[PDB]
Design a protein around this nucleic acid. Structure first.
Lengths: 52, 71, 104, 124, 98
RNA sequence: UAUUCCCCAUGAACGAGGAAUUCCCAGUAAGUGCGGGUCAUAAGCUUGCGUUGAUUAAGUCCCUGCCCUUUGUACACACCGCC
RNA sequence: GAAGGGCACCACCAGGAGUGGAGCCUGCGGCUUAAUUUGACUCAACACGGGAAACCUCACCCGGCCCGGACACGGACAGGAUUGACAGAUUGAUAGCUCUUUCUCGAUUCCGUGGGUGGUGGUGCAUGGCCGUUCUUAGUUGGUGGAGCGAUUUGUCUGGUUAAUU
């Protein structure tokens, strides 16, 4: 067990979607780390309700 | 797309050599074992650890496979 | 004992927070002591604005995902009974309750 | 069940040393086990081309840290240690010759370890 | 009956010790909560357990990248016979109820 | 393969934009920063926010495109048709 | 390119603001390029895929490593299946990935066969969901009647009204 090495510490190497491990359009804010779609799926359940 | 030409040098997938390995063990008359050649400095490879002649290489194989030098 | 207790009520549901908030006033005033009624902090609006579209295309429409979080808090002075009565009763929905010891 | 038939008293100690992870299993690890207290019990092959290899065993075995047995045949000497992955239901599993292991840390205790190491140290 | 012996023999006996073994799908952990004497992340765990299911001596869920390894009644035999463990054994689901 | 920033240094076209065409009526257009989002690094990007805050329509279908009604239709892959 | 009615500043009028001109930004097109992966083609494709990318991203090219070949089914007891190898030839790499040497884990290993397992491979004219839009436009539907043998039709409308069969 050796070699699989870089900065996996910053850069999107590191961070990915908690639901589906895709690595774009990522809701970093507010300690979510969902992909932007994985919001609208896991959104009502979270608590973000569309008001206005 | 392309279809891969490959510069005609189809690289070798290689066998790690066959080798019975342990015949060369000097049993001088009664039961007693020790030959001499070159040695490695490691701990799990404790003193018995054993070396060579190649086109250069020499290696030591006894912190399981952890630790081959550079000669 | 009589110590400077703060109860910090943080929840999302305004109605299901102010049934609890009222029950702490009416729970303490039953066994009267002191209070300084419910304080009203600014409500924090957790506002996210993502594209409606998965993938690229269509005229650019986004949603406006919101979550509120109103904080009430209620000061009081009591022993380790009146705290452990008033806090454990009037729980239930999605309501978080803090209990500060005194002053800091 | 498990009351020791013929040549199956070494088999449970080898099968439990196998699975307890610690078999100094060959001329090399056997001799580096016999060189230390790493050695304990063993099963040598009667049949042996250039019997210098059985002699290196015997000579080390016969020192303090007293070992031995005998077990006839090269062609049997492994299938009561560990060496088969199940592939094929009727076990035709494997097939070359077999030779000198060094059984370390027995397995736990009992089963065949009060049979063979009370019977070997005191063959009476 | 495979791979790094020290690590994988410990993964079996972890799973026999427990009713359920959760994980994460992440090759780059060098650890896993409870056990992890050494390294043995996903890989050594997965490689073992994704063997166990396919032969049949464990059953899955997945649920937001994690692997939901639930121990099968047939596996009770496979792993205790792997681990020579006592014919009572009692894995973990002893379960005093009421 | 000026990352981003600073400090120097060089120091361009543009003196209101040819054919076209979108935006909208009140705290509206415009300017104006500022947050957020994007971020290790970082925005000329968007989405919000005030702030300064105008002119002008307040009607019509004249162009474009929409609704109903009546009607004609050899169109029903519906006129970007059929022939 | 019929007619009445009605309506929208993605229409106009009345303007301002611009926009279209310059430089610059970055969006695409093309050429060029080994590579400038790529989706997206009027409108409802063009700072849009949250698409501000050194490395990751990343798939793509010039290489080059690595195996993470589950699983079973087969093959491999030992003169140890090759688990895993500290100085140099090298190589980019202190990649035993490979050319001797060998010293350990030690029942793992390796080689077949079937079979997977993935794949930011393919196909959005094989689909789910989600989105875009025809279209914040006024529309759509049935129960009972009444009309049509019956598809169908009225109810669902001349006019006044209304942001809006309201």
């Amino acid at each position: 067990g050796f070699y699989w090495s870089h900065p996996r510490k910053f850069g999107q190497g590191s961070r990915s979607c908690r639901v589906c491990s895709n690595r774009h359009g990522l809701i970093r804010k507010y300690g979510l780390n969902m992909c932007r779609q994985c919001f609208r799926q896991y959104a009502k359940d979270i608590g973000f309700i569309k008001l206005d | 797309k392309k279809s891969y030409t490959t510069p005609k040098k189809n690289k070798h997938k290689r066998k790690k050599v066959k080798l019975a390995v342990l015949k060369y063990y000097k049993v001088d008359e009664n039961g007693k074992i020790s030959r001499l050649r070159r040695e490695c400095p490691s701990d799990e490879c404790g003193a018995g650890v054993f070396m060579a002649s190649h086109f250069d290489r020499h290696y030591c194989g006894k912190c399981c496979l952890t630790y081959c030098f550079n000669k | 004992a009589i110590h400077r207790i703060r109860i910090t009520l943080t929840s999302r549901n305004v109605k299901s927070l102010e049934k609890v908030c009222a029950d702490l006033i009416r729970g303490a005033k039953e066994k009267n002591l002191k209070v300084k009624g419910p304080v009203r902090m600014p409500t924090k609006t957790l506002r996210i604005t993502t594209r409606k579209t998965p993938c690229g295309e269509g005229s650019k429409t986004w949603d406006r995902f919101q979550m509120r979080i109103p904080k009430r808090l209620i000061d009081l002075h009591s022993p380790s009974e009146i705290v452990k009565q008033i806090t454990s009763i009037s729980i239930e929905p999605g309501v978080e309750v803090e209990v500060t010891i005194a002053d800091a | 069940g498990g009351v020791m038939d013929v040549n199956t008293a070494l088999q449970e100690v080898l099968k439990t040393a196998l699975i307890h992870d610690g078999l100094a299993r060959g001329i090399r690890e056997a001799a580096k086990a016999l060189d230390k207290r790493q050695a304990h019990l063993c099963v040598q092959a009667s049949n042996c081309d250039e019997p210098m290899y059985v002699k290196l065993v015997e000579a080390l075995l016969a020192e303090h840290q007293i070992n031995l047995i005998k077990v006839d045949d090269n062609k049997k000497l492994g299938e009561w240690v560990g060496l088969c992955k199940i592939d094929r239901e009727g076990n035709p599993r494997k097939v070359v010759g077999c030779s000198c292991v060094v059984v370390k840390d027995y397995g736990k205790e009992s089963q065949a370890k009060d049979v063979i190491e009370e019977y070997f140290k005191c063959k009476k | 009956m495979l791979m790094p012996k020290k690590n994988r023999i410990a993964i079996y006996e972890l799973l026999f010790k427990e009713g359920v073994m959760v994980a994460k799908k992440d090759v780059h952990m060098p650890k896993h909560p409870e056990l992890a004497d050494k390294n043995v992340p996903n890989l050594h765990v997965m490689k073992a357990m994704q063997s166990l299911k396919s032969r049949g001596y464990v059953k899955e869920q997945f649920a937001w990248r994690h692997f939901y390894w639930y121990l099968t009644n047939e596996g009770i035999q496979y792993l205790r016979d792997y681990l020579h463990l006592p014919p009572e054994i009692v894995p973990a689901t002893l379960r005093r109820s009421r």
